[model samples]
Target: GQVQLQESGPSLVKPSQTLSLTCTVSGFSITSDGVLWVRQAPGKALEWVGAIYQNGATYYNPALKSRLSITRDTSKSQVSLSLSSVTTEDTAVYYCARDTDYDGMDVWGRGLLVTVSSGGAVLTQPSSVSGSLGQSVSITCSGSSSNVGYGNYVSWFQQVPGSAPKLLIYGATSRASGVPDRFSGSRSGNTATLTISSLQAEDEADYYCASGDSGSSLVFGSGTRLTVLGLE
Candidate 1:
């Protein structure tokens, strides 16, 4: 058993709520490099939730771009999945796997059943920050206990000028595909944060964070504009 992963999470999720799951790995180092994925099935059909690499890079199913979050902590040999706004349609057996990247899934978890019973916003802050290239910058998004509160997770988005906004972070801490390791997210009390490390010219963008409110409605931060100053 060179690579093994065990999946764990709550079997029940109320409709419109979020579902959280974890995969604890063994027999391999998840940091060096590899792709871990979260897959799901209902009865017999299968679906790909998302995938994350050891370096915090990721790829999510296009249709699920706004609802799924995949993240991992290499130091802990663990990978996690967070899916939002679940309905009975989301009830399924979830699995985690280590992929060779070329093949399907190399090593697979035993799979856990996540059921849906049925149920379920935010403020982002700082307004703006002028960070020099290669520096670390953190932006804050605050809301009350009713929104960016306990038992809730947040998502962060990045927008350059034209084109569309990119899901920089989801499920509070999950990094999106092609997103650099420098971007990370966290929450404490009514505040949620998006932190960038070793900023680069590409880091110049407008950032926003979001979370669900007590109304089962989604709330988005006013947005933060990052001014990256290139050094000579």
Candidate 2:
């Protein structure tokens, strides 16, 4: 059987109102596998909100701890989310994904947009960074409103031109399954940094840092292009 996930929700919401979404899963039992909610703002990368397991145990992003609720209905084979006290900053496309593994998500839905009347917030980062091969380069993602300072995990991705983006680090500092030790992640105050050591020509790529927010939203830094100087 093939697993599939779908997200259903209202397309428009008012400030201070609540937003609700449903994740209907098929080809698998909702009580056996887990469901997770993720969202992405315009011109940004994906962000995780929380997950609901078959056992009814739920885990939410620390940034969203207060305003987010994830629940499951085994009879309906569905998982749902309720987010209250929303604002323009909450606008984004929400998606449902099967938590096929403990550390990652798989089988994602197409995503549904939820826009607020006012403008939305954005994530920011250094536009570019340069370092010599074999040296160390650090790029920072920053913003006062970013959720990173509040004990949220930061995820980092490397996007090489003409290729798919690769997960380098997740949960703030843990390297992905096959990521090299040279790449490291850290968080401090309202900022998160991704550091690359022993930089090589192959390390030259666009890097992005992201964090989950209290509003069931995910924000991604604008992205930084790492340049390898004196690459031979």
Candidate 3:
């Protein structure tokens, strides 16, 4: 059986506090699978946070090596991490990977989001969502009352195969000039939603939600996949 990595941790962590989380591993030992942590910051590229190998060796990204402490309890089939002095930029969707061994990302977790401030943070949902042609689908982005609930900071993007990600909606409800009206953004409670009407084959893409507040805003969401199922 293949491995399953479940990431369990806080949805909100105070700034300047240590970021703590755990990967409850199953179907394989950390020894053979060699688990690692990977993340993508708000509007940033994918970064390899750190990893632990079967040989009891470890690796940490140079940028984070000094602030990170990765420990394991093989006896418990667990690998947890601690990153001290986290700030806003440190906030993003953190994920678990089977290996950092050039295996094309091996496998990933459902994702664990840790917000750094109590003031507010924007969040997206569902690592994967699917819809077929002629159907209507929605992807959600959530935040606090001050974030998505209080005003106009929420935005949505569509990332297709290789072309750059396209801005679909901004100001929470305004659609980009080039974006079709079929794509709409709406909000209720702390939830900001993106709805696609008459979903088409051409509408398939990865959708992400974002927000900007103060000094530096944290870009986060589950990075939902809008799957158009039909073709093999």
- lDDT winner: 2
**Superposed Cα deviation of residue 79, candidate 2 (Å):** 0.7
Could you tell me the lDDT of residue 79 within candidate 2?
88
What is the clash tally of candidate 1? Answer: 10
| Superposed Cα deviation of residue 120, candidate 1 (Å) | 16
The lDDT of each candidate is 0.70, 0.75, 0.73
In terms of lDDT, model 3 sits at: 0.73
Residues 1-232, model 2: lDDT tens digits = 2767778878798898889999889898877777777776776555667778779888876677789989888998888899888988888888777654445443567778898774643568888899998999899888554367656556777766543346677777777766789999887788888888899888988887766565544566778888888834
Q: Note the clash tally of each candidate.
A: 10, 1, 1
Pairs in clash, predicted candidate 1:
14-118, 15-118, 15-119, 58-177, 121-211, 121-212, 121-213, 121-219, 124-141, 125-140
Whole-model lDDT, model 2: 0.75
RMSD of each: 13.9, 6.7, 14.1
Candidate 3 residue-wise lDDT at 119: 75
lDDT string for model 1 (1-232, tens) is: 5667788888698887888998898897777445544444442323456677667778766667698888888778888888999888888777676654333233567678778884443364777898887889999988888778844457776756542345677667767666788899887888888889998888888886766566544456777889988655
Best by TM-score: 2
List candidate 1 segments past 4 Å from native: 101-104, 118-232
